Amino acid sequence: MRECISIHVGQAGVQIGNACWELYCLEHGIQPDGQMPSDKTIGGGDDSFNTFFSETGAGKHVPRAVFVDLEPTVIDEVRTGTYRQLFHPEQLITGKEDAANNYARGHYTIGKEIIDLVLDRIRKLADQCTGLQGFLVFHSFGGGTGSGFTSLLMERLSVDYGKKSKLEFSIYPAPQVSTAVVEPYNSILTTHTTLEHSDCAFMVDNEAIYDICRRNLDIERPTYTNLNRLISQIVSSITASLRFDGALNVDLTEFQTNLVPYPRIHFPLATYAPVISAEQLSVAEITNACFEPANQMVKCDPRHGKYMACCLLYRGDVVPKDVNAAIATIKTKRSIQFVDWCPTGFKVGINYQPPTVVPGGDLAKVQRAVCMLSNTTAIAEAWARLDHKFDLMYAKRAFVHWYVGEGMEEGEFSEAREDMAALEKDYEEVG
Amino acid sequence: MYTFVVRDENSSVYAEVSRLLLATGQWKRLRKDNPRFNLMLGERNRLPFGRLGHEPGLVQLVNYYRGADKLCRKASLVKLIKTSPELSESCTWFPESYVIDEREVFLAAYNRGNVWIAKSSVIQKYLEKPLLLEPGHRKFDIRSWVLVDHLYNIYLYREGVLRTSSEPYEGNEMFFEEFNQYLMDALNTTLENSILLQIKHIIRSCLMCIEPAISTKHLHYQSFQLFGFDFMVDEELKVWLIEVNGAPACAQKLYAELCQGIVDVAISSVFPLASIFIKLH
Amino acid sequence: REIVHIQAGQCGNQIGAKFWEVISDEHGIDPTGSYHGDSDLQLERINVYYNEATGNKYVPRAILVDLEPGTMDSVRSGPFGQIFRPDNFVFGQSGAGNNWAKGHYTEGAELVDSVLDVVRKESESCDCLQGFQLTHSLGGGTGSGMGTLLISKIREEYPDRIMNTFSVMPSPKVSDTVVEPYNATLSVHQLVENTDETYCIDNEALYDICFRTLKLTTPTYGDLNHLVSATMSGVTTCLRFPGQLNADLRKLAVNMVPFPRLHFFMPGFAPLTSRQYRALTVPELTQQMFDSKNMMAACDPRHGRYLTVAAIFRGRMSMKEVDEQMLNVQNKNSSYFVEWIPNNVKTAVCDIPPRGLKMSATFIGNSTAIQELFKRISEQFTAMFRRKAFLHWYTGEGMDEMEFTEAESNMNDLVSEYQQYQDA
Amino acid sequence: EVIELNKCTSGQSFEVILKPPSPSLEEIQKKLEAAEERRKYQEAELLKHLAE
Ligand SMILES: Nc1nc2c(ncn2[C@@H]2O[C@H](COP(=O)(O)OP(=O)(O)OP(=O)(O)O)[C@@H](O)[C@H]2O)c(=O)[nH]1
Ligand SMILES: Nc1ncnc2c1ncn2[C@@H]1O[C@H](COP(=O)(O)OP(=O)(O)CP(=O)(O)O)[C@@H](O)[C@H]1O
Ligand SMILES: Nc1nc2c(ncn2[C@@H]2O[C@H](COP(=O)(O)OP(=O)(O)O)[C@@H](O)[C@H]2O)c(=O)[nH]1
Ligand SMILES: COc1cc(C(=O)N/N=C/c2cccc3ccccc23)cc(OC)c1OC
Ligand SMILES: [Ca+2]
Ligand SMILES: [Mg+2]
Ligand SMILES: [Mg+2]
Ligand SMILES: [Mg+2]
């Protein structure tokens, strides 16, 4: 058994993190006070769920998590939430004043003064691991902390935990749930600085979550809570292999092996089905839905790209025979072209426990669901959209003085933008 | 009020569509690079489809189908017909063709009249026995205009045009009324029976083949496109597909009617204000 | 986080006094500092503007400044006069004679250290000082000259805090003295350098709105100030009540100011109703909020373009319908928003409406048409300065002609910087 | 073709193939210090300007 440490940065990272651990506790039968009656070994164990939860002599199951934000109001909800009893103070780190939507304030000015502390509190969790695999890092692209401090933290982690894997769950900005007009600047700056430090990153476009919530849950004006409960189901789908018995994606290393042949192109597209508001869909139908743009975590058209890898992760009443049948049908109906230097296939994982939903939430509990992870070049459409918004503002140097005022140089902007131009280029060389 | 942008000022067709739109009083033309448009009359090359359908509160429509180039490139049209089981190498209405790779398969057939034509925006049979108009003893080709809307309805404009030769074998343009009368007088048949049934069959076949790859049915932006199909007719009144053009012009006599038809069928269907086509399926 | 409020001079203290009456009412605070309200939303963010004193009384974090006592005597006997901390009344006796030089260099210099002592005492009792907001006019002597001297010394001492002003611009239509353009031109350069965000409140607009829209034959300063206090409540709603955003002065400046000198905002308010019970649908709020007749700076926004816009809607309404109507304004007038700042409009909602209204809307625009305001003042300045008319009032306080030349140039530079981006 | 079928009590996994193929601590501290020094410089220029 090898441990994983989850790190939540900025408002988006913290609030999504709080929703994921809630869902984890429900999935594992862990009550808000951290007890777990089904866990018959007290004060220890190397069970699969111990990859995310350590244990106390009193029987409390403690998330292997650190929450960090540069203002206190969001994390103050964790230490007073229904699951406040799970965490201890050393796990919740708050600063005085936030990054004011400014990458440079989060990376340079404020990040410099809190980074050693955050690393100490992470060191404390690492010291309790027999064999740490690495870190899962949750954050927005668009916030000053989520962008600026995350990129700083990822750098130090590569120094202090060189052999360890790092995965990202990143929120890509959408004007329909906008916080700041400079979010394109922050997104590109943090992608440039984090790119060589991240082995695999799952991007979620708030535009896609917003529309799925409006369309499939009939929510007129989705809130962050609506969004995060949907996001947490998807995150849960991705991490379930780490927390349950199984043979697919059983350590962090395996995510890279199965989804990322070319290391810079490490952004798999996630697609999830079914999303139903509170008739039961078949294996064929939920699989077919994995190839509809309307169910993707990033709106884009995979028909106009090439696949490098594809993983299907089923929860519920699913048997391999029905998956093979469904795949037979879809392949002869849909445009699914792999790159020539990869095999045209699917890795399939099935967890018999159907998805858990928060009681009273907006998601209907289903008998089967699936999350597809595909490394398709079509996700580059999201880079192109973002790089274009960057270019419009940067041509006039709009808002740049806020970043130079924090000690950043103007040349870091065009340095980061040239990297993104090379990224868009690498994606096109594959297609 | 609906909004549109113009990104191909060389478009004879859509220069007229925009004139009609503006003259509606209910469409406003924006600067090309303004993203808050309902309608993009996009550029012929490198149209940024990835930036469409991401503007909150805008239904967005564009006058090109992403991926339709497979049909409208001479090289990939050959690949598409031979490798699509829907069409397959054994379809009766496309001449034997080869790209240049395929050097060695070509010669396997050439060894055995072997007149061939070569072209490239790759080598196919030259139709030695074209149907010749009289008087004149001359060669022609048939242009058909086809509109595919956002629902993938297929609309064949009822007016085609023949591009005639002056030399043995007005404006080298003959329209369907006259060609029909000729076929009745010379060969005792009609344009509908001897030719158009084949043309409609080929148009349906080509466009239903690619529909899974290019349809915008469940997509975050919608597409339509105007296609120009080019046909040859042999002495036995068999129709052959030559080329599919994705950016066609029109005959001056028919711009008014067709461009208006575009507004009614492809644009106003999505953006309604306050026939001349044959629907194939 | 805490904000320290300063009100300076006659205008500054009169609009500042009404501001505290208005927001005290909204937060359920009576004239004696004791709270009486039915909703805890009133208290979630009350420490932004109020200190919690001994017992459970709330005290405005407000400093009242003037070089003569008259206007602050009437504040102290005003409706909410007794809520203010008596130590925070800081005044002299000389006055400033509608003279920027007296406010900035002679009379004001003698009093400013005492103001900074009170500011320091308030900032020290702040868990996390956000910054300062100053109310003042630019046409007089104390608000304009001593007010701009104050912000300069506040910047020197708290350089990393935000400086926000509500600045009343003079107009010949609503004028006390002919030297107002001199005082306003001297002040604007100070504001260009030493504030992060300035709400431009033009007495020309306030008069036209009272006269034309509210149908007030013969507006008074009191009527002008009713418009101003309504606007001030609007623009500070996000600071004073919880929203989806964690709103504060620095995030506002980051998102509103693309270039450091262009931080002069056009405020607006809707509805403006003559004394009324009529329901106003969300489409009506949105068109009125964007209408020139509802702007407080007397600049035609169609003569320029919007760099950034913040909008705040107050009351019970469909947030879906808010987004729809807001998106509709942007998509159907996209020319009047600059294309090189994508998605430059942010909307906030607050379920609590202001006193007397079911629904209201507040507009904050960073528009290049504000150059018309600075050009109007520049023209009026030059008409006198080319004849050196009335300059002896200033040279008598030790100022030189060169300093007027330098303020005229700085002003015209500002106008040209706006025109630079109006064509782009 | 199906391969690598592993079966346990909580589920199973397998693979379907349809067609074969055809900076150190010091460096970081340096960039952070450089930014802080530029910050300190801009600040001293402001306080020099205000002293004038
Ligand atoms: N899905 C989702 N997105 C969020 C959530 N909270 C914020 N966001 C998004 O995150 C971006 C804003 O960044 P934040 O995380 O709020 O900012 P921050 O990381 O706290 O950094 P600061 O600038 O210091 O506040 C926007 O694009 C928001 O839409 C959340 O709970 N869920
Ligand atoms: N296989 C063939 N048999 C007979 N004629 C052929 C032929 N291929 C091409 N042609 C002749 O070539 C002419 C047009 O050639 P082609 O269609 O390949 O080029 P192009 O792309 O310029 C056509 P368009 O002007 O419609 O865009 C037609 O008039 C036709 O008679
Ligand atoms: N809106 C408004 N404007 C005022 C008020 N009092 C003065 N003014 C304007 O402010 C300017 C005069 O400055 P004033 O504040 O009286 O002088 P000060 O005491 O030296 O600051 C002129 O432009 C007046 O029209 C007021 O109560 N309300
Ligand atoms: C919407 O209004 C407010 C926003 C804030 C605030 O934190 N951030 N503002 C952000 C932003 C502003 C204006 C335009 C934008 C366009 C797109 C995205 C964000 C922006 C604070 C306020 O008060 C200080 C406030 O009220 C005036
Ligand atoms: Ca145990
Ligand atoms: Mg934050
Ligand atoms: Mg051609
Ligand atoms: Mg006065």
Short mmCIF file of C-alpha atoms in Angstrom, two decimals, chain A residues 11 71 73-74 96-102 105 175-182 210 220-224 388-389 392-394 396-402 406, chain C residues 1 128-129 160-162 196 244-246 248 250-251 253-260 307-308 318-320 323 327 339-347 421 424:
data_model
loop_
_atom_site.label_atom_id
_atom_site.label_comp_id
_atom_site.label_asym_id
_atom_site.label_seq_id
_atom_site.Cartn_x
_atom_site.Cartn_y
_atom_site.Cartn_z
CA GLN A 11 -11.06 28.90 -3.27
CA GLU A 71 -7.39 34.43 2.84
CA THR A 73 -12.92 32.73 4.68
CA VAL A 74 -13.13 29.65 2.43
CA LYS A 96 -3.93 37.18 5.74
CA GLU A 97 -4.82 38.72 2.36
CA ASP A 98 -5.35 36.95 -0.93
CA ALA A 99 -3.59 37.24 -4.28
CA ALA A 100 -6.19 39.73 -5.63
CA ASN A 101 -6.65 37.65 -8.82
CA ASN A 102 -2.97 38.31 -9.62
CA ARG A 105 1.06 38.38 -6.15
CA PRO A 175 -16.97 33.90 -18.29
CA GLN A 176 -20.36 32.56 -17.18
CA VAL A 177 -18.84 31.93 -13.72
CA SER A 178 -16.10 34.54 -14.00
CA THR A 179 -14.08 35.98 -11.14
CA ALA A 180 -11.59 38.22 -12.94
CA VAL A 181 -10.97 39.77 -16.33
CA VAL A 182 -7.29 38.66 -16.24
CA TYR A 210 -22.35 24.85 -16.02
CA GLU A 220 -31.47 27.48 -14.10
CA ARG A 221 -28.49 29.30 -12.51
CA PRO A 222 -25.96 26.74 -11.24
CA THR A 223 -23.94 27.64 -8.16
CA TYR A 224 -20.48 26.48 -7.11
CA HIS A 388 -6.33 34.03 -28.26
CA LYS A 389 -7.90 35.90 -25.33
CA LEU A 392 -6.03 40.37 -27.50
CA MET A 393 -5.16 41.87 -24.11
CA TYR A 394 -1.39 41.50 -24.27
CA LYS A 396 -2.14 46.48 -25.69
CA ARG A 397 -0.37 45.42 -22.47
CA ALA A 398 -3.72 45.81 -20.71
CA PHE A 399 -3.40 45.08 -16.96
CA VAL A 400 0.30 44.14 -17.23
CA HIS A 401 1.34 46.86 -14.76
CA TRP A 402 -0.41 44.98 -11.96
CA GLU A 406 4.63 42.72 -7.91
CA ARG C 1 -11.33 43.54 5.68
CA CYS C 128 -6.50 43.58 7.90
CA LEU C 129 -6.69 47.14 6.60
CA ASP C 160 0.60 49.05 -0.10
CA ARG C 161 -3.04 49.93 0.66
CA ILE C 162 -5.73 50.93 -1.85
CA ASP C 196 -6.32 53.56 -7.43
CA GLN C 244 -20.59 34.86 -4.86
CA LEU C 245 -17.51 37.08 -5.17
CA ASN C 246 -15.35 37.86 -2.15
CA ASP C 248 -12.76 44.07 -2.07
CA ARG C 250 -7.99 45.67 -4.66
CA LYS C 251 -9.80 43.07 -6.77
CA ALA C 253 -9.00 47.89 -9.13
CA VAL C 254 -7.24 44.92 -10.74
CA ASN C 255 -10.28 44.13 -12.85
CA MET C 256 -11.29 47.74 -13.67
CA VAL C 257 -7.99 49.54 -14.36
CA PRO C 258 -6.04 48.21 -17.39
CA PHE C 259 -3.60 51.14 -17.35
CA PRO C 260 -2.67 52.76 -14.04
CA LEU C 307 -12.81 49.51 -21.08
CA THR C 308 -14.47 47.68 -18.15
CA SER C 318 -34.26 36.21 -11.45
CA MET C 319 -30.47 35.95 -11.68
CA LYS C 320 -30.99 34.05 -14.94
CA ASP C 323 -27.54 37.45 -16.93
CA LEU C 327 -25.49 39.60 -22.03
CA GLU C 339 -12.59 44.26 -28.37
CA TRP C 340 -9.13 43.87 -26.79
CA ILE C 341 -10.48 43.21 -23.28
CA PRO C 342 -12.62 40.07 -23.62
CA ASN C 343 -15.60 39.65 -21.31
CA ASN C 344 -15.06 43.06 -19.67
CA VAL C 345 -18.45 43.24 -17.84
CA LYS C 346 -19.01 41.67 -14.42
CA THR C 347 -22.41 41.49 -12.73
CA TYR C 421 -7.55 54.04 -26.58
CA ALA C 424 -7.79 51.51 -30.89
#
